[PDB]
Symmetry: C3
Subunit: 351 residues, 3 copies
C-alpha cells in the first residue's frame, strides 16, 4: 500500500500570482518535481523539473528568453521541452534530450495541471467561473502547505460543525451550526451539502456590512465537492429579508493537490459580493482568512494526522455521526473513482 | 518486528508533581498516546489521548469540570471515558464513542499505569513504601527523557562499576567499586545485588554529614530489580561502627517506562535519612542528582544506543565479564517473563 | 540501493594528516563502519573499530592512557593493536574475546589512507601521488568537505569539467571555452586519463595574477587520471607566449572520495601549486578560496541532483549521455566491473 491519487483530473499546481514572468517557479506535485515559468506572451509552461542529462533540477538553471539552460552542463530546452542547444563537443543534440511537458489550464486565478500520461481533457476542469466574474478586488487567492494527506483537509471542509469550537472571532458560529442537520445530495457531477441557521452577532467576516452589525442574521453554507479535491463553499448573511438574495455573501473555492501521501498543497480563493472595488480591504480579508485556516484549522488537522500515523482513516474504525455523512460519501466516491480509473487504465491499455 | 514489553505490570507514567489539577497532561507510553488529569477531589485519571470520532488528541481539547471536550467537534467524555454529550444533529451519543481508560495507582510520588486490556492487579505494584514514610523534604522525584531502549538504562544501573570512571565529584567512587565482586541473588520476586567497599573521602553526596568528612568511610550498594523496569538502590556511608545501621544513607528508586522501542521515560526518586526537614537542601540535592544522570550517564548510554543501532544486545555478541552477571540475569528474567506472558495469552486464546 | 557495494581491497582517505592532533581521539564513519584514529608518542597513527566489545560504547568517548585507550563506560584498556591490556573488574582476568579490530593505515600525500577489507594490506595498491610530498611545504595544502550524496556523483562531476563554464563563479570560471573542447581520453590497466586543452581571456583567476600579463589571454591544460577506488589527480595551469606548457603557472591537485554510507561521502582535496611556493599566508588564502568554490558552487548542484535522483542507480534512470560524458562513464563501468570481479574471487576463494 503505496498511496494512489486520481491521475486524469486537474489539480491546482500554483496561484496565478506565484509565477512572476522571469521567475523559474518549482513545486512537488503528486510526488513529481515540476518547474513552471511564463513566456514573453504571458503563456504559462509546466515541465518535469529534471534535466534528462544527469538529472539536475532545471529551476536551478538560468533562463534564456523563452528557453531554460540547466545550471550543470547548460543544455537549453524550449517550452515544448525539446533540447534547442548542446554546447559540448561536436554540438549534435541527442533525440533523447527531452523534458516531459504538463498540460496547464489558467482559470479562476490558478494554474491547473494534468499530470497523467494521457492527452488532457479540458472538459474535466470544473466550472468555478463566478470567481472570474466581477470587479477584480473582490476575488483574492491564498496558499497554505500542510504536512498531512489531502483527504484530511477535504473531510474538515465537508464537516463545518468544527467552526463552532475550533475557530476564533474572525469566523466563529458560536455553537449554532453544530445542531443543524444539513441537506446533502449525491449527484453524477458533484456531492452538495447545505447548512442554514441564525446567530447573534452575525459572523465577523460579514457583520459590519449588515444593516445592524450587533443584531442577529440568517446564514447559509452551500458547498459541493468535485473530483479530485475541489469544494466550492458559498456563504453569507441576510437581515430582515427571507430571500437570501440580499445577503452580504461570498463565493469560495477550497482545492487540494497532494505533494505526496502525507503532504498537501491547500489553495483557497474567496470572491466577496460587498465593497467590490476596495483592494486595500481585499488584502486585509484574504490575509485574515489565511490566518484563520493556517493558525486555527492547520494545527488540529496536523495534530490528527500525527495521532493517526500512516494508517488509513476508515481502518482505525472512526465513530462516525450526524455531521460525518457528506465527508464519508466524498471519501467513498473518490475511492470508487480511483479504482474505476485504475480499471480503465488497463482497459485504455487494451482500448 | 515491533518490539515486545511486559503488559500486566505497573510502569511509572508521570511524577505526581506533573499533573496540576486543571492541567491536561499528555505523554506517549508503550507506543500509546495517554492523557492524564485530576478531578475536583484530586483523583487522577488516565485515558487514550485520542477522540474516537476523527482521532484528534483530547489534551488539545478544552476541560469542562470533570469532563474533557475534544477541540475539533466538541464530543465530551467523563473520567470513565464514555461520551457524556454530542452537540451535533439529533444529539444521540453512540455507545461506541468511548476512550479506553488506563488503571492508575498513585504511590511513591508517581502515577503508576496498567496498560494491558485485562483488569489491574494492584498486588503486582511492588512495595517501595519507605519513600512514603518520614518528613516529606527527604523524599524528592526527578524525570529524564533519553532517546534509547529502556533495557540500556536498567543495564547501566545494575553494573554500578561505571561510577568509578563515568561520573564526576558529586558521586564518584574513585576506582574502588570496580574491583569488588558483588553478592547477587535471583529470587521469585526480585533480583538483588550488593556491593560493599571503602574509599577516602566518602562519596560527596554523604561526606559532609559524616563524623569526619575528609576521612575514609565503608559504603554499601544494595539494589533489587523488580518487573518491568524498577530498581530500588539503597546506599550510604558509616564511619567507626561495623553495624551499617548508623550510616548517612538513602532509599532510591530508578524506574523506566518505554515511550517506544528506542525512547525511554526514566524516573528517579531519592529519600535521604539525614537533615530530613531541610527542603532548601532537598531541591539542591535532587537537582544535583538529575545533573549527574542527565549530563554524565545520559550521553554515554545515548552514544552506545547509536553505535548499537537497532540490533538486539545479545545478538551483537557482547564480551560480558565479572560486573555483567546481575544485568544479564535481569535481561533474561524480563525476556523469560515476556515470553511466559505471551504463552498464556495464546493458551487462554485456546482455553 | 540496499545492496550498496564498494571496492573493499583498496586504500580510501580516512582523514587529512592535520585532523589527528597527537593526544586527540579522532572518530569518523567510513564504509558504514565507526572508526577511531589517534597518534602514539612517536607520531605513529593507529586506526580501530570505534566500539568497545564489552557493551558497544564508542572508544573515542573514552579517556587516553599513554599509547592505550580506556573506554569511558567500564574502563577496559586497549593497545594500538586493539587487544585488551587491563580489566579493572572482579578477579581482573582479561577475556581473549576483548579485542578491537585494527585497520591498516598508510600516511602519504598529507592523508591517512585506510584498508577496510578483512585481508592483509597491499601497499602496492596505494597509487603514486608523490609530487604532493615534493617541494616547499607551503605550496601543498589539504581541505575536507562532507556532502550528503553517493561518492560516484562527485567523481562524475570532476570527470566532466565542462560544468566549470556555467556552474562556477570568478575564482576558477573558464567562461564558456572548456565546454566545446572534445577531450583526449585513454582507458589503461592502472588509470583512466582525460586531457582538455584550450585558451581564454583573462586566464583563470587562480593563475592570472602570476602570469606575464594578467588581463591578456593564456593557453590552459586539464590532465586528470582516475585510479580505484575514487582518486582523481587533476593537473592544471596557464602558459603565456611559450608553446611549451613547461613554463605554465601550474598546480598538482588530488580529488579523492571515501563513502560514509550509500548517500553520504567524505570528499578530500589537496592542491600543490608551483608558484610563490614559500608564502603560507597566501597558501591558506588559496586552499580556503578553493574549498569555497567546491562547497558553495559544486556542493549544492551535486546534492540537488542526488535529491532529484532519489535512491535509484544512475544508469537505471536512462541518462542522456553525450560528448563530455565518455570519461565519467568508463570510470563508473570500470569501478563496477572491479567490484563484481572482487566479489567473484571472494565467493570462489570461499570455495577454492
Ligand atoms: S544535467 Fe543539465 S545539462 Fe547536465
Ligand atoms: S474528532 Fe473528537 S471532536 Fe470530532
Ligand atoms: S562498554 Fe567499553 S568498558 Fe564497558
Ligand atoms: Fe550512573
Ligand atoms: Fe567543480
Amino acid at each position: 500500500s503505496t498511496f494512489e491519487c486520481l491521475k486524469r483530473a486537474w489539480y491546482v499546481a500554483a496561484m496565478s500570482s506565484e509565477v512572476e514572468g522571469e521567475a523559474l517557479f518549482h513545486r512537488r506535485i503528486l510526488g513529481t518535481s515540476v518547474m513552471i515559468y511564463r513566456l514573453a506572451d504571458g503563456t504559462p509552461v509546466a515541465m518535469h523539473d529534471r534535466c534528462p542529462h544527469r538529472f539536475a533540477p532545471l529551476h536551478l538553471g538560468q533562463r534564456e528568453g523563452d528557453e531554460i539552460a540547466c545550471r550543470y552542463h547548460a543544455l537549453r530546452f524550449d517550452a515544448d521541452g525539446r533540447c534547442t542547444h548542446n554546447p559540448h563537443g561536436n554540438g549534435r543534440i541527442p533525440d533523447a534530450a527531452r523534458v516531459r511537458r504538463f498540460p496547464l489550464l489558467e482559470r479562476y486565478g490558478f494554474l491547473w495541471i494534468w499530470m497523467d500520461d494521457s492527452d488532457p481533457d479540458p472538459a474535466l476542469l470544473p466550472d468555478f467561473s463566478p470567481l472570474e466574474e466581477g470587479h477584480p478586488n473582490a476575488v483574492a487567492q491564498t496558499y497554505m502547505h500542510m504536512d498531512v494527506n489531502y483527504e484530511l483537509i477535504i473531510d474538515n471542509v465537508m464537516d463545518l460543525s468544527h467552526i463552532d469550537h475550533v475557530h476564533g472571532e474572525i469566523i466563529t458560529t458560536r455553537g449554532q451550526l453544530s445542531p443543524v442537520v444539513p441537506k446533502v445530495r449525491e449527484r453524477d457531477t458533484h456531492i452538495s451539502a447545505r447548512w442554514e441557521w441564525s446567530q447573534t452577532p452575525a459572523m465577523m467576516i460579514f457583520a459590519p456590512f449588515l444593516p445592524r452589525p450587533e443584531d442577529a442574521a440568517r446564514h447559509y453554507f452551500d458547498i459541493s465537492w468535485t473530483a479530485p479535491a475541489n469544494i466550492q463553499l458559498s456563504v453569507g448573511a441576510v437581515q430582515d429579508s427571507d430571500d437570501f438574495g440580499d445577503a452580504t455573501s461570498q463565493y469560495d473555492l477550497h482545492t487540494c493537490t497532494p505533494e505526496d501521501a502525507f503532504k498537501t498543497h491547500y489553495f483557497f480563493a474567496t470572491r466577496r459580493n460587498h465593497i467590490v472595488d476596495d483592494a486595500d480591504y481585499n488584502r486585509k480579508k484574504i490575509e485574515a482568512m489565511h490566518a484563520a485556516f493556517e493558525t486555527e484549522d492547520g494545527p488540529i488537522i496536523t495534530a490528527v494526522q500525527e495521532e493517526m500515523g500512516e494508517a488509513e482513516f476508515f481502518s482505525l474504525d472512526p465513530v462516525l455521526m450526524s455531521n460525518d455523512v457528506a465527508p464519508v460519501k466524498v471519501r467513498r466516491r473518490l475511492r470508487r473513482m480511483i479504482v474505476e480509473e485504475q480499471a480503465a487504465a488497463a482497459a485504455a491499455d487494451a482500448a
